[PDB]
Amino acid sequence: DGVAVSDGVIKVFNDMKVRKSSTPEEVKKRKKAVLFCLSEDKKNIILEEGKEILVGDVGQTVDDPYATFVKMLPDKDCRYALYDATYETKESKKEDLVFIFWAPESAPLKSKMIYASSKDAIKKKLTGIKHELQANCYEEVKDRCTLAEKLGGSAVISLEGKPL
């Protein structure tokens, strides 16, 4: 294991998982999809302010929340992710969050082992999360069908406001 989580990531997770009554002007700067990284010393899990996605922009500048999210992941390094999905099932309409474990083969072993052995140190602190998505290849995470296959399987008819 080793690497632990900081207070900022826990605060961001508690902010995203549990939403409250908010003003219409402030509700547009909520966090939609945020990644997690390591510092220079590789001892804390920190979110990078550079790569991120707001809830406000979704549906405006970002035509596709998932489509613009695949290219945001660097293919030469290992990354964490937290995607808030809004998929439509035949049965009903659900809105859950997804934990994406991005780990390409082109990344060095020093960044793969650290992020693989410390996955239980971050996933345990994220209470109440259910949908786990482990992705290693880029083609498997780039496809849109895999998210509906992991979330609900064949039952998910529409993903992110558009049919499959």
Binding site: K17, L97, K124, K130
Partner: protein, 370 residues
Amino acid sequence: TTALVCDNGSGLVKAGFAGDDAPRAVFPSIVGRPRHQGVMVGMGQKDSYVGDEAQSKRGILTLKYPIEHGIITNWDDMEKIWHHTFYNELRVAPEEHPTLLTEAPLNPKANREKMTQIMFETFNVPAMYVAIQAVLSLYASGRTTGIVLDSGDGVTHNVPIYEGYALPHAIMRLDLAGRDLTDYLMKILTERGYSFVTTAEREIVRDIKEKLCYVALDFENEMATAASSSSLEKSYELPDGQVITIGNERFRCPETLFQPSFIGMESAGIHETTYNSIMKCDIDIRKDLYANNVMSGGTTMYPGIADRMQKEITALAPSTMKIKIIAPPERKYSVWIGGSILASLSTFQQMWITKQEYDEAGPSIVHRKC
């Protein structure tokens, strides 16, 4: 501003906001403690698992339902499920939006008192209300007249409701529901060579009953067809890889709804309790109750249950009277639909029990208000 409606059913928990068509949160209401020691160290092993995470890890868990036939047996896991569906599923706080709870009629007052106490002390909601599942399932129908056949996973109850005034003296309650059907299917599937003993396995039988069971138009001729040929048998794909061949069990275990003598109950089937309650009702409202039999719940989703209910009722009711069985295609969540259409009503917004009203009254305000 918006109000939460939480149908804390015996088998599923339909939770969602008000003013929308479909419930966003749907999951089985079971908690699972880890059965084995757990040699592996780390990875986030937890003390409990609620809902879909329990369904996925049901192999190493010991699933159990906190709600029996409508009464809440265990309270710690019930409030745990409430906290889960509030925080880890909807990601909202109860302190902001008012919550709406549902229950079955002829319910012990201790259950409603504990519900109110948990909602007002642990979560500190601004306001709440405890409605009836059948009344809300009738709201979802858009009409106000007709008896409701509400049968979920733990209790089946019927309450006739006229043009706004319901009849509390004719409220029938039957402890026969989907859980009893699943138990009977497990008991009758051992005669084919498939033993389901453990709780985790029992969910496989539950899905088999959900997607392979139907109610016959009549029992005798369907048995005669079952006896002769395999034209009726159908195979199922088990999660382990094996296949099973069920025959008369496709329509024998749903017959318990109409013949309770299979699981041993002495209660009249769901086709006779409705007729007895209508015959206990007033003689002028019977003409309107006969042609309006609103069905709801997941147990009323068998293919052909509407036709058999019809046939049985016109067999019991006089010939001149016409029988109609309203079978909506969204009757699995009709209680939640009614709760959501009820929470948006302006006239109802005044009768929520509030904390300021709750302080001096204690946990006994719910009986006098609701």
